[PDB]
RNA sequence: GUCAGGUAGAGAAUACCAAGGCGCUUGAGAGAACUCGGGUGAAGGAACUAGGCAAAAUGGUGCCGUGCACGCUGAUAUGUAGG
RNA sequence: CUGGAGAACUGAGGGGGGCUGCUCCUAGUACGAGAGGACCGGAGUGGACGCAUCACUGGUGUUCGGGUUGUCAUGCCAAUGGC
RNA sequence: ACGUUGAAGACGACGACGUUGAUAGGCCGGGUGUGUAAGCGCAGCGAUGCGUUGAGCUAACCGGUACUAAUGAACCGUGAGG
């Protein structure tokens, strides 16, 4: 008593996680953003240390060569000194379509 | 940390290292009225449960006609000594399929 | 199964004696007669009578 | 006291007893009730500690009146006209040494296995209500 | 009514793909007070019922038992009887 | 003997409850013309119902890990993932 | 109230903590489970096994750390009690 199906849920987070890495920021429902964190940062932590095995495992997740290239190259070093908390969630009102709570989820970067 | 501190002194550090599928002899104390006898049990380990003070292992013995399984508490005072006879070369954590082995030479 | 050598090979339990709505004694079967099924946390995972006395509390059984 | 997990103890003979292990800090009295004021005899006791910023001063003043350090929650037990207590007195777990059966709140008539004061720890044979970290009240068994 | 590719298979079953055709005309979070439907879950496997019904189990064929073989063969032969 | 809050107590009344059987000491005792042989109280050993209920004994666990059949994608083989 | 938690079994005003701040989502260490991964090398130049390596991986939990985010203004409830 708690004290989408599994396949669809896993695929959605895999896709959304890839989009977040590619764009550094995405607009999505607040519950999705909160649950996405438990899938996103673990990728960046693995990318902090580079190895053949880590590269392969990082590919097995998100199943995309572009993301793996994006990781291990700049997301790794840019967060090497940071111990967790690579993500930030900003609430941005409600979606007009169905009044869903929306929030921007964005990596702590882009300080130009 | 309260639980761990309480069990460290209760545990025994003389536990021999054994792996599933090994042939093990275990000595167990026996009480008959007013006498303490040492009983020797021969068998093959088919399962090990590691939980610290609650660690236990299952030993299956092929008796005269049918097998007998016995779950021993590693840290219980009842068990006195454990000796390994053969180094079984299996590659499974739990050997339950023996209900219905090579030798490691390492 | 029968642990002894009385001749019987397979038996069925038809009543669990020892209490209402229940090595305990049981009643088994076309001959119906009583029978007996044969602390540290360990577990041990793996006989006929005469309806009046054991005569295969079980000194004889343990000795045999 | 506070429930802190559960474990077992092996005796010399061989039998193993499953024990509920309860941590019991020193319990310090805060108020004493009498016939003159409250119409009955009881002592109010506290335990643990609470953040100063989180403890509202209506209780802090109540604690400060007795010289007591602010603890978490308050409980009080009735007296049996055979014992006396003074405000601010500190009560530790050795009081359970002479008693073999205790009542944990209610599951009653539980054997006590071990008591020590250096670690403020009490041991009970069996299971007690509530999950880990919950508050428990241990009193001597009434069914003598 | 006709035209219906490749692999696996005895087949026109079923699963997985290319080309082509699509996401079916309300959605985002939270978990079950068990109204409904599957897989799995100790066994004296009938302690239920008029009826072990509906499930489950089951099904096959590198076959000599009225139990055995089964996914791969350095090699026999870097393709054996032969159209 | 009605100012506005945060706690610890006194418990009338009401609801769920007054398990069962056997052995041993008491005791070759009481009753009875003998044998047979107590009852109660105390202690100990099972089963049934209910609360608590996991350190230890089992089962289950659509996310992690090991192994694998048919087919397909990620321009490839190996190494993976999805159905 | 809002936000981070809800093992009290979804009517939720409830246990605590909300920057003198480790409740949850991460980054480490230890234990358990899985029982010999990816890659490299020797022999057989195949199907396996051995060294590399009792190792790699491990969610809700255990032991630590705030360089992320629960921040700083309102609303409600009063001012001496027949």
Swiss-Prot record, chain A:
Keywords, comma-separated and alphabetical: Ribonucleoprotein, Ribosomal protein
PROSITE patterns: RIBOSOMAL_L17 (PS01167)
Tagged with keyword Disulfide bond: no
Residues in coiled coil: none
GO annotation (BP), single: cytoplasmic translation
Gene3D superfamilies with a match to the protein in the record: Ribosomal protein L17
SUPFAM superfamilies assigned to the protein according to its UniProt record, in alphabetical order: Prokaryotic ribosomal protein L17
One Gene Ontology cellular component annotation held by this UniProt entry: cytoplasm
Gene Ontology molecular function terms on file: structural constituent of ribosome
Classification via Pfam families: Ribosomal_L17
HAMAP family noted in UniProt: Ribosomal_bL17
Self-association and partners: Part of the 50S ribosomal subunit. Contacts protein L32.
Stated role: Requires L15 for assembly into the 50S subunit.
UniProt record similarity statement: Belongs to the bacterial ribosomal protein bL17 family.
Protein name: Large ribosomal subunit protein bL17
Gene: rplQ
UniProtKB/Swiss-Prot annotation, chain B:
Keywords: Ribonucleoprotein, Ribosomal protein, RNA-binding, rRNA-binding
Signal peptide residue numbers: none
Pfam families recorded: Ribosomal_L19
GO biological process, one term: cytoplasmic translation
PANTHER family, sorted: LARGE RIBOSOMAL SUBUNIT PROTEIN BL19M, RIBOSOMAL PROTEIN L19
Function recorded in the entry: This protein is located at the 30S-50S ribosomal subunit interface and may play a role in the structure and function of the aminoacyl-tRNA binding site.
Similarity field: Belongs to the bacterial ribosomal protein bL19 family.
Name the UniProt record assigns to this protein: Large ribosomal subunit protein bL19
Organism: Escherichia coli (strain K12)
Gene designation per UniProt: rplS
UniProtKB/Swiss-Prot annotation, chain C:
The protein's assembly and partners: Part of the 50S ribosomal subunit. Forms a cluster with proteins L3 and L19. Forms two bridges to the 30S subunit in the 70S ribosome, contacting the 16S rRNA. In pre-50S ribosomal subunits interacts with RsfS, which may inhibit association with the 30S subunit.
Disulfide cross-links: none
A single cellular component GO annotation: cytosol
Swiss-Prot/TrEMBL GO biological process terms: cytoplasmic translation
Protein's recorded name: Large ribosomal subunit protein uL14
Organism: Escherichia coli (strain K12)
Key words, A-Z: Ribonucleoprotein, Ribosomal protein, RNA-binding, rRNA-binding
Taxonomic lineage: Bacteria, Pseudomonadati, Pseudomonadota, Gammaproteobacteria, Enterobacterales
HAMAP family registered for this protein in UniProt: Ribosomal_uL14
Swiss-Prot record, chain D:
A cellular component annotation (GO) from this entry: cytosolic large ribosomal subunit
Protein family per UniProt: Belongs to the universal ribosomal protein uL3 family.
Assembly notes: Part of the 50S ribosomal subunit. Forms a cluster with proteins L14 and L19. In pull-down experiments interacts with CedA.
N6-succinyllysine modifications at: 33
Alphabetic keyword roster: Methylation, Ribonucleoprotein, Ribosomal protein, RNA-binding, rRNA-binding
PANTHER family: 50S RIBOSOMAL PROTEIN L3, LARGE RIBOSOMAL SUBUNIT PROTEIN UL3C
Name of the featured protein: Large ribosomal subunit protein uL3
A Gene Ontology molecular function term of the record: structural constituent of ribosome
Modifications after synthesis and translation: Methylated by PrmB.
InterPro entries for this protein: Ribosomal_uL3 (IPR000597), Ribosomal_uL3_bac/org-type (IPR019927), Ribosomal_uL3_CS (IPR019926), Transl_B-barrel_sf (IPR009000)
GO biological process: cytoplasmic translation; ribosomal large subunit assembly
NCBIfam families: L3_bact
Cited Pfam families: Ribosomal_L3
Function as written in the Swiss-Prot or TrEMBL entry: One of two assembly initiator proteins, it binds directly near the 3'-end of the 23S rRNA, where it nucleates assembly of the 50S subunit.
């Amino acid at each position: 008593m708690r004290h989408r199906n599994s396949s669809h849920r896993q695929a959605m987070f895999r896709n959304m996680a890839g989009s977040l890495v590619r764009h550094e920021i995405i607009k999505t429902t607040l519950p999705k953003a909160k649950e996405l964190r438990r899938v996103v940062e673990p990728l960046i932590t693995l990318a902090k240390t580079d190895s053949v095995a880590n590269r392969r495992l990082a590919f097995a997740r998100t199943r995309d060569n572009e993301i793996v290239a994006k990781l291990f190259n700049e997301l790794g070093p840019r967060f090497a000194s940071r111990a967790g908390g690579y993500t930030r969630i900003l609430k941005c009102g409600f979606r007009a379509g169905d009044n869903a709570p929306m929030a921007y989820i964005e990596l702590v970067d882009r300080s130009e | 940390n309260i639980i761990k501190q309480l069990e460290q002194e209760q545990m025994k550090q003389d536990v021999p290292s054994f792996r599933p599928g090994d042939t093990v002899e275990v000595k167990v104390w026996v009480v008959e009225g007013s006498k303490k006898r040492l009983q020797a049990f021969e068998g093959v380990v088919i399962a090990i449960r590691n939980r610290g003070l609650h660690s236990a292992f299952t030993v299956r013995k092929i008796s005269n006609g049918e097998g007998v399984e016995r779950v021993f508490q590693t840290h219980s005072p009842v068990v006195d000594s454990i000796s390994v006879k053969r180094r079984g070369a299996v590659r499974k954590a739990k050997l339950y399929y023996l209900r219905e082995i090579k030798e490691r030479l390492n | 199964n029968v642990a002894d050598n009385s001749g019987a090979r397979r038996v069925m339990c038809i009543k669990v004696l020892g209490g209402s709505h229940r090595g305990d004694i049981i009643k088994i079967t076309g001959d119906v007669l009583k029978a007996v099924v044969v602390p540290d946390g360990s577990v041990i995972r793996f006989v006929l009578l005469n309806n009046n006395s054991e005569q295969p509390k079980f000194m004889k059984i343990i000795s045999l | 006291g506070k429930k802190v997990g559960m474990t077992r103890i092996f005796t010399e003979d061989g039998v193993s007893i499953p024990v509920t292990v309860i941590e019991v800090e020193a319990n310090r009295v805060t108020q004493v009730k009498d016939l003159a004021n409250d119409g009955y005899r009881a002592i109010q006791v506290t335990t643990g500690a609470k953040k100063a910023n989180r403890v509202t001063k209506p209780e802090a003043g109540h604690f400060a009146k007795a010289g007591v350090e602010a603890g978490r929650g308050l409980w009080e037990f009735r007296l049996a006209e055979g014992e006396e207590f003074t405000v601010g007195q500190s009560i530790s777990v050795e009081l359970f040494a002479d008693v073999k059966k205790v009542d944990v709140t209610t599951v009653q008539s539980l054997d006590v296995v071990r008591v020590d004061a250096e670690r403020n720890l009490l041991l009970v044979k069996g299971a007690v209500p509530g999950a880990t970290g919950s508050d428990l009240i241990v009193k001597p068994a009434v069914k003598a």
